[PDB]
Design an enzyme around this catalytic site. Sequence first.
Site, PDB file in Angstrom:
ATOM      1  N   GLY A  21       0.831  -1.206   0.000  1.00 58.78           N
ATOM      2  CA  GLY A  21       0.000   0.000   0.000  1.00 58.78           C
ATOM      3  C   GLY A  21       0.861   1.250   0.000  1.00 58.78           C
ATOM      4  N   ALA A  23       3.433   1.936  -1.601  1.00 62.90           N
ATOM      5  CA  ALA A  23       4.856   1.685  -1.836  1.00 62.90           C
ATOM      6  C   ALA A  23       5.137   0.323  -2.466  1.00 62.90           C
ATOM      7  CB  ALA A  23       5.639   1.800  -0.535  1.00 62.90           C
ATOM      8  N   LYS A  40      12.092   0.560  -0.566  1.00 59.76           N
ATOM      9  CA  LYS A  40      10.695   0.963  -0.623  1.00 59.76           C
ATOM     10  C   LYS A  40      10.691   2.157  -1.566  1.00 59.76           C
ATOM     11  CE  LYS A  40       7.525   0.130   3.258  1.00 59.76           C
ATOM     12  NZ  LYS A  40       7.511   0.031   4.745  1.00 59.76           N
ATOM     13  N   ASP A 132       0.117  -2.242  13.656  1.00 60.21           N
ATOM     14  CA  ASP A 132      -0.177  -3.326  12.719  1.00 60.21           C
ATOM     15  C   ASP A 132       0.666  -4.566  12.995  1.00 60.21           C
ATOM     16  OD1 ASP A 132      -1.823  -4.145  10.566  1.00 60.21           O
ATOM     17  OD2 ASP A 132      -0.158  -3.861   9.134  1.00 60.21           O
TER      18      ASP A 132
END
Length: 312
Positions: A21, A23, A40, A132
Amino acid sequence: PKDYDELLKYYELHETIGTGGFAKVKLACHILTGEMVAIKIMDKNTLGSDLPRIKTEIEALKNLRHQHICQLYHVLETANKIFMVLEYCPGGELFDYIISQDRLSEEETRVVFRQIVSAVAYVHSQGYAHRDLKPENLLFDEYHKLKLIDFSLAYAAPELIQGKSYLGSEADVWSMGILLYVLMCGFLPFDDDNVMALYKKIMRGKYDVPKWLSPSSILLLQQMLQVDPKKRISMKNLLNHPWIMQDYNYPVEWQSKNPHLDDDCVTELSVHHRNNRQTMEDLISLWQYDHLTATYLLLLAKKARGKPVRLR
Ligand SMILES: CCNC(=O)C#Cc1ccc2c(c1)NC(=O)/C2=C(\Nc1ccc(CN(C)C)cc1)c1ccccc1
């Protein structure tokens, strides 16, 4: 297309490994050291209005210096792109590991879990949260050591799920409790075949306790998996938890063992750049997260993993 020109002076690009998301994640090699890194890539035109949020978040990641966090080495911004070069973890995800072994014993879970607690404690100590935590965001290095990455619904806290305001730190404790259950059981505590049913099960907080779990295990799960975030165990109480302490008899050391400049790395850079020691030390100490910072941190990692501190 001109955005890659500066980058390609320092890195050789290998395969894409993640179209995540916001990247793309590419595998690459740092030429001067020959070390593998993860890169990234973000497009500034598609970040649009968020570009300042991200630039500020990048500055927070510069301070994440810890043995159980994937380190940022290099930030390169061009006309249309931002490139972030990061520590490579060859060992793959903890997710893969748990599937292969089916479930970990309490003893092996403890080794794994102290490392996670270590990194999460450090993150919270700096005034941040991960937000996360899941086995896909924990990687092994070549020595089977855990590294946190990427600063899902199954691991998310009840308050986060309801869209209420939530404290990152408190949500991180719930998520670690789900992680803990998964490590020791080999399956999720809350699962269902549609989002509404799953959300409801998470909110109610009831789960099965398999008969192979120790009483001490059960109790720590009960302190972490509290639907009311106020009732959840604190970080303080987690680092010195009896279950955490079993077979070790000292609490989780969470403070960064990472630094003062390393003399071997400085020497090798001074040799390569044909400088006096003191000149290289001043330049490295700017900490610009440019190519010099990258090369220095990668030599410091060759040293840290016993390898020779050499440039080609
Ligand atoms: C500053 C705080 N840190 C960050 O914000 C961060 C990060 C981050 C994110 C990802 C990676 C990383 C670091 N290092 C890595 O090596 C990564 C990846 N390695 C990776 C990929 C495929 C294989 C499998 N091989 C066999 C191709 C192994 C390894 C990776 C990429 C995409 C998804 C999962 C993992």
